[PDB]
Design an enzyme around this catalytic site. Structure first.
Site, PDB file in Angstrom:
ATOM      1  N   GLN A   1      -3.465  -9.049  -0.719  1.00 55.05           N
ATOM      2  CA  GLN A   1      -2.105  -8.814  -0.260  1.00 55.05           C
ATOM      3  C   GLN A   1      -2.013  -8.148   1.107  1.00 55.05           C
ATOM      4  OE1 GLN A   1      -1.431  -6.752  -4.200  1.00 55.05           O
ATOM      5  NE2 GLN A   1      -0.697  -5.055  -2.925  1.00 55.05           N
TER       6      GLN A   1
ATOM      7  N   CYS B   1       1.708  -5.733  -4.860  1.00 58.24           N
ATOM      8  CA  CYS B   1       0.832  -5.531  -6.009  1.00 58.24           C
ATOM      9  C   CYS B   1       1.495  -5.942  -7.323  1.00 58.24           C
ATOM     10  CB  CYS B   1       0.397  -4.063  -6.048  1.00 58.24           C
ATOM     11  SG  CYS B   1       1.152  -3.049  -4.758  1.00 58.24           S
TER      12      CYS B   1
END
Ligand code: NA
Ligand code: NA
Ligand code: NA
Ligand code: NA
Ligand code: NA
Ligand code: NA
Ligand code: NA
Lengths: 241, 98
Positions: free
Chosen positions: A36, A42
């Site tokens: 990411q 997340c």
């Protein structure tokens, strides 16, 4: 909207538990780690990861869904700078589904849009679930991995091979997936006893080749509440069935 | 209390934590001026796949601003650049986010 109250009747309520070791990475469930970079997603990563695992265990489909889809179409969640794991499953239950990692991309710290017509594939859930602060190993196996959280720090991020017997973060500020448990045989430097060093194999949504491919395992126990760095706490699991 | 995102108003640091003044070579791209070592006041932090700091600065007419100066992982070791600049702010405009 659904809980553990009547979900272990279909797996392991009337059965027995190996209170030692079960890596769901090794039994056709865990999907390739995805990164990411510099845009907090997340939560969305773990959401799609858990749905990947569910499909991968039942009909054994190595399909991978997208994470920017739930950075732009996050209705009751926040977005690419924070968000909750449980209210993403619900937005997913009403919208209809997430588009594959090819049919919809992730661009990390970069503005992007949402279209729920960039796919033709029906990928969705029916219910989600919460698992208590202790049954992280007990419900990791017969139900599947758990979208959990961990206290992120520079200690947690020291990405070498080993059991994480170290310090942690000061707030529960990172979402991960619990992907198994195990045990190790080391010895004391005094009386060379086989110190039973059990652990939790925990994934990282960073997707980096962090230590064990992107899976730093952390010191836990045979039961599952000593969990350091808040290993658990907000633990959520989706169900396609 | 939410996964990997908006933190709380953080006061300030000790004598050392000098991410505040790494602006001198990194404003050069688009925020370049005689504005060197811009005066930061309050701080904040965020987490994605590494460290993601935040700094509230002053610049120009003593006009304040916010800075998405984001750090990261140690492939080499230390690295940070302003992944977004916005110079129409005040002290009251702190470090909202996004
Ligand atoms: Na419920
Ligand atoms: Na020791
Ligand atoms: Na306890
Ligand atoms: Na709790
Ligand atoms: Na530092
Ligand atoms: Na003036
Ligand atoms: Na203020």
């Amino acid at each position: 909207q659904m809980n553990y109250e009547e979900v272990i009747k279909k797996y392991k309520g009337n059965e027995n538990f190996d209170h030692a070791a079960y890596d769901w990475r090794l039994h056709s469930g865990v999907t390739p780690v995805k990164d990411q970079k510099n845009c907090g997603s997340c939560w969305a990563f773990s959401s799609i990861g858990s749905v990947e695992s569910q499909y991968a265990i039942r009909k054994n489909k190595l399909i991978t869904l997208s994470e920017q889809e739930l950075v732009d179409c996050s209705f009751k969640n926040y977005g690419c700078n924070g968000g909750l794991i449980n209210n993403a499953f619900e937005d997913m239950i009403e919208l209809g589904g997430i588009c594959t990692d090819d049919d919809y991309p992730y661009v990390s710290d970069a503005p992007n849009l949402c279209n729920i017509d960039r796919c033709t594939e029906k990928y969705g859930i029916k219910n989600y679930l919460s698992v208590p602060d202790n049954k992280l190993k007990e419900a990791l196996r017969f139900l599947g991995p758990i979208s959990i959280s961990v206290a992120v720090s520079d200690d947690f991020a020291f990405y070498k091979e080993g059991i994480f017997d170290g310090e942690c973060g000061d707030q529960l500020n990172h979402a991960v997936m619990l992907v198994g448990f195990g045990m190790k045989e080391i010895v004391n430097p005094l009386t060379k006893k086989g110190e039973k060093h059990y652990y939790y194999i925990i994934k990282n949504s960073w997707g980096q080749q962090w230590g064990e491919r992107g899976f730093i395992n952390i010191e836990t126990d045979e039961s599952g509440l000593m969990r350091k760095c808040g290993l658990g706490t907000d633990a959520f699991i989706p169900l396609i069935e | 209390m939410i996964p990997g995102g908006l933190s709380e108003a953080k006061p300030a640091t000790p004598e050392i934590q000098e991410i505040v003044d790494k602006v001198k070579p990194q404003l050069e791209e688009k925020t370049n001026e005689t504005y060197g070592k811009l005066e930061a006041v309050q701080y904040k932090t965020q987490v994605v796949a590494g460290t993601n700091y935040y700094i509230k600065v002053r610049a120009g007419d003593n006009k304040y601003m916010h800075l998405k100066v984001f750090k990261s992982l140690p492939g080499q070791n230390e690295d940070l650049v302003l992944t977004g600049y916005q110079v129409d702010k005040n002290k009251d405009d702190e470090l909202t986010g996004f």
